[PDB]
Amino acid sequence: SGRENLYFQGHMKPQVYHVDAFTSQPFRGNSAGVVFPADNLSEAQMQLIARELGHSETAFLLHSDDSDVRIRYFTPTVEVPICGHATVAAHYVRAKVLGLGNCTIWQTSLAGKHRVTIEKHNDDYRISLEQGTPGFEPPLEGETRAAIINALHLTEDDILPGLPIQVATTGHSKVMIPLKPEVDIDALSPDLNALTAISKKIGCNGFFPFQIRPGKNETDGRMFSPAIGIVEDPVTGNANGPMGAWLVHHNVLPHDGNVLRVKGHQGRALGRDGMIEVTVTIRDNQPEKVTISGTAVILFHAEWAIELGS
Template identity: 25%
Template sequence: MNGSAAAVLVHACLRDGTGGSPTAVVLDDDRLSDEERRRIPVEHGTSHAVFLRPERETETAHGRPAFRIRFFTSGEELPACGHGTVAALALLANRAGEEGEYRALLRTSARTFEGLAVRKGAALVNAAFDPGPVDLRPASAEERSLVLSALGVAGADAGPDARVAGVGRERLLVPVRNRSVLAALDPNSGRLREVCDHLGFLGAYVYSPPSPTGELAARMFAPSIGVPEDIANANSTACLAAHLADRGINRIAVDMGDAVGSPATITASVHPEPTGPRVLVGGTATIGTSHTWVRG
């Protein structure tokens, strides 16, 4: 490697203080190449790596710090990563060491948005952010059929209201009959990648019916970006929250990660505003105690 950076392992979207999605968060000196950034998830055994570069404080009344944020898997750079954003905010709040609410502006190539985090004692941080407007449309018959076939979901086990949803890249939201159907899924990963590449989808987010209080389970399959199954997918959960809000469900808590041995929970809420519904999505994270240095 030609660059150097400090990487911190953050477990994002914990369930009851354990599990979560391990994410490498790198305080980036901007000397790593993109090829080097793609290696970091592999070296650290994570699905994603997040890269933060400090920028000047913004000219706001509160002087919130601003950071350029980028997301990588082993295969490519992503325009967004929800659990990666939770991990980044948790690390920033922990480093700031402030009591109360920590707020920062995060900049991607496409947008600038605010994230917030609150420390919970010495070990845990609650973090949340607005992923931006969610685009929703009904899935076509071809989209639904191709994805269900690759997932191995029988027609009787799938709900009729599959939706194509996007915050950045599109993905298919696939309802199934119950948690047992969800747990038994064993997709053909190669076929699902071909289908998602053909349709231009990030992947398929499969979910069980929500309880009256908004609890449900989900699994996210994204082989097109090198992630056969994601432990925690916050942006897809935000998409689902926007979809379920039309049915009067404004808060959800989604269990993920059980099938890959790392239980995670993501929360999302929908808030009406004059410009349209605003989604907040997030979770609880814990910061690794050891730092790993990536040297050139």
Template identity: 25%
Template sequence: MRIYQVDAFTDRLFTGNPAAVLVLEDWLPDDLMQAIAQENNLAASAFVNPRADGTWDLRWFSPTQELDFCGHASLATAHILFTNFGASAAIVFHTQAGQLRASKDASRYQLDIPSMPPEVIDALPPELKGMFSSAPAKVFRNFKNIFADLGSADAVCSFVPDFAAITQIDPLGLVVTGQEVESAKADFVSRCFAPSAGIPEDPVTGSTHATLVPYWAGQLGRDKLVGHQASKRGGWLTCELTNDRVLLGGNAVTYMEAEISL
């Protein structure tokens, strides 16, 4: 069986977020897909299966569990379908997170994903309070993560996570974010930690931007933004909020094609 490994939300190898992509003729058993994802040991492995109408079913697995939503592996999958499987028109994915769409122009890919507006909460979960030297400017959440606005990009970059504490808020992860200075290439930065899903720090997380984009659009008063995920590998996302959807733009490059023996 053919497997591809793609670096997503980057135009350079060894940066962005790596994902495995397997294009199937029919679904594999769930436990086998989970075992493959564990063997790959990447933040996400995507399994995509064609429908008769030309659209695709898409599922994602981390090393430890099936994921409800994964943006970077969706971008990686679109990249493989466009470059290796002759896709030319916009791609429609059916997923647990709803319908996702992917398109391609001369310079980048674009993902069309649901907007998940932030749900403001009064305070951090008690398990997390000890890891912040000062109280976050704002705290909010979506169905999957707790978000903390640390007030600045510098605070995000210097943040030191306590993985044991973050694991205690399972099944949620923690996202820290902050506004970048006016002269910077990005408008906001973020980092994402999901140790309970086998992902201590995710290099670039498309799904969190379903909430970060409406949050920062409200904070900054505009719908078109640039996000930078300030992990060690790093990645860049062009972002646009449009009605109840978020458009994420980025590049992807193939690192590896291989055969796996099952």
């Protein structure tokens, strides 16, 4: 049963998958590694593997007693609690390998417990991640506002009217920067140092300038986080998830049911286009909770040719 499963995840030869998340187009989206089983691996070995692969992050699948699966996420230099694109990549590989079909499962990580939805359709899969409740910090103003706006080489004439530049979150905060549609978003070339400078002043390592497609509930954004290693992440679930919540919170986009659906595009300027389906369940015209969804494509997978363990 659950004892036989743990025995296998400790005696089977480890494998590695290379997948591009939030896209079905090879070489696009956000790439992430997935290695399993990892039960017979040390925090050190895992960190060494993530450094070897070089993806923004590699997900390691472990055995879980209460949940369906335990995942640990590693950047090439440090472990991280949870990661959006690496998570969809992980469950995409897990669905392919096990031929899961439509269902819902629970994962466990330093970020706690999360439910994931797997939807089979024409040989492929769409992965849904229930991010939970969103949060907003007081709108950034005065000198800081102008600091963020100037670091992007833009003027107040470029920001959507009546909308604030503020930190929104569903786990890993990001500063929402609402741009008018005329702004050439791909031509943006921020003053990276100025951004990390203000990230230390406000306590948010991510800036998310985005614009809304005319007459559509779709967006195009770019995620800059120079304060940390990542200069620009191709497609960020922790940016688009809170964006949708932010959209509902400020009634920026019209919603009819008890839900708001937004297709968040990202990564075009990087040549790594991706798309995250953001669905916000609404109650009392407020963003109750956020779910992000996307697909992925496996570039290749292989059984490690070297022994893994100590």
